[PDB]
């Protein structure tokens, strides 16, 4: 416990994450321009409206590829367990900045895991429905009725994921010190103690113990 910080995120998972974020800004904004045509300015997200129609789906595929790399590296830490119940019951208390007092928080809390599955499920929905409605390459192989349902579902899934990311960015801005961990990779031990007790307890034990195991 004699270091200002502890590593929370490896460089590879940090590089990926900020790649996703940049791709997501372009894809969400172009998507929103088709959804709300009154917001004319967003038709210039990829330069021109004609260009935006072409590039949206390609950047969409890139997000899904990078989210699948994230999926295989974080899924094991996002698994719901009986210890998450406490969180789910004192949500009102957590939102007032008192989660430590009410719950058992490991690597990622119960909100973060709900988000994780939400985000991962929506991107799968968006990938499937996106392919189905993609002209000129793929929509021609699908029955008109499936294309129509896909148009409805893709719009709805994209809106749900945008909401979700608005809340995800808010929380990251709100639980102070979090953005620095995602940019630089390190979290101060006290942040760990307050927001993620069980997690830091494990690092601290893994740490000390294996260095005690060496035989100083």
């Amino acid at each position: 416990s004699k270091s200002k910080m502890i590593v929370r995120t490896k460089f590879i998972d940090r590089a990926c994450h900020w790649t996703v974020v940049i791709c997501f800004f372009l894809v969400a904004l172009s998507g929103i321009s088709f959804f709300f045509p009154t917001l004319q300015w967003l038709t210039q997200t990829f330069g021109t409206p004609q260009m935006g129609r072409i590039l949206h789906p390609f950047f969409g595929i890139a997000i899904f590829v990078a989210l699948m790399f994230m999926f295989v590296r974080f899924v094991h830490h996002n698994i719901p367990d009986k210890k998450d119940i406490p969180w789910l019951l004192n949500i009102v208390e957590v939102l007032k900045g008192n989660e430590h007092k009410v719950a058992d928080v490991g690597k990622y809390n119960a909100g973060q895991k709900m988000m994780f599955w939400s985000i991962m499920s929506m991107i799968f929905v968006l990938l499937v429905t996106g392919v189905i409605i993609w002209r000129p390459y793929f929509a021609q192989y699908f029955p008109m009725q499936v294309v129509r349902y896909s148009l409805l579902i893709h719009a709805a899934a994209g809106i749900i994921l945008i909401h979700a990311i608005l809340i995800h960015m808010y929380m990251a801005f709100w639980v102070k010190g979090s953005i620095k961990g995602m940019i630089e990779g390190k979290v101060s031990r006290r942040w760990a103690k307050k927001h993620h007790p069980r997690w830091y307890r494990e690092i601290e034990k893994a740490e000390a113990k294996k260095e005690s195991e060496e035989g100083i």
Partner: protein, 289 residues
């Protein structure tokens, strides 16, 4: 814009978002100026300005018949006169000058404003003035030195090939007016045939180097000439021999763009991945442990 749905080329438009051009099954048209039948009457200058509702200024005489002395925003076609003894006897070579309506227009290629310059399926290259920003890049991109800026509105103008007459089935004003029938108009295919017949008669009269001027460097033109001395186009008041889009313009408007794009994307990636990889450079990274 695009109401005619036959726009085959459009300035400053990415190649993966082409302009509307479904109605492209139309014959190419062309004007044929046979300078061997031209009498330098200037009727075409007068008919062009009358039809187009434009008037240049009353200029000056500086020693030659040529007047106005150059193309301008108010003069879309001008007769250029040349006196020469280069071929062994005195000859007065007179040539009508103005837009060549190139198949591969350099004006269009150099223009940086989307939709300011367009090419119709029939070959007409025309300026869409609502989009012109007055930069003048087209003046340098043109191999023939055609475009002219109007000081009163900061926009370029030139011969439109009487697109307003041709679009509804009538030949251009200068073509109809030409007293001697030096100017002919029709489909490009039949103007090339008339051109080759006229060349054959000029050769029969002793002009062994008569020929058609329809430059391959710009992909052929929709305004073509029949010249008595096709081996020496510069005799006709500087008509270019083997014109093409300048190499500097090709590279500036071509490869430089994507190259710059890659640099910028690459640079942004590098700097972003660099900051994240190594982290800030603060006064003390050392008393952080």
């Amino acid at each position: 814009a695009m109401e005619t749905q036959d726009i085959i080329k459009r300035s400053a438009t990415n190649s993966i978002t082409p302009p509307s051009q479904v109605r492209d099954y139309k014959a190419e048209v062309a004007k044929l100026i046979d300078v061997s039948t031209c009498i330098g009457c200037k009727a075409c200058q007068v008919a062009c300005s009358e039809w187009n509702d434009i008037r240049d200024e009353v200029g000056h005489c500086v020693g030659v018949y040529d007047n106005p002395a150059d193309l301008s925003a108010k003069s879309w076609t001008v007769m250029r006169f040349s006196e020469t003894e280069q071929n062994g006897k005195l000859e007065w070579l007179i040539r009508k000058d103005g837009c060549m309506h190139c198949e591969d227009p350099g004006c269009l290629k150099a223009c940086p404003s989307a939709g300011a310059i367009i090419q119709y399926a029939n070959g007409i290259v025309d300026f869409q003035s609502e989009n012109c920003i007055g930069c003048g890049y087209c003046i340098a991109g043109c191999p023939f030195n055609i475009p002219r800026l109007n000081k009163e509105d900061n926009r370029v103008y030139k011969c439109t090939l009487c697109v307003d007459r041709v679009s509804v089935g009538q030949e251009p004003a200068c073509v109809k007016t030409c007293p001697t029938g030096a100017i002919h108009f029709g489909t490009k295919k039949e103007m090339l045939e008339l051109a080759e017949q006229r060349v054959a008669k000029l050769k029969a009269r002793g002009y062994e180097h008569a020929g058609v001027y329809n430059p391959e460097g710009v992909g052929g033109t929709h305004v073509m000439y029949v010249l008595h001395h096709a081996d020496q186009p510069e005799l006709y008041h500087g008509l270019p021999k083997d014109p093409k889009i300048d190499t500097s313009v090709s590279l500036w408007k071509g490869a430089l763009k994507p190259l710059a794009a890659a640099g910028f994307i690459a640079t942004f990636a590098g700097l972003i991945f660099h900051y994240i990889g190594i982290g800030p450079n603060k006064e003390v990274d050392d008393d952080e442990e």
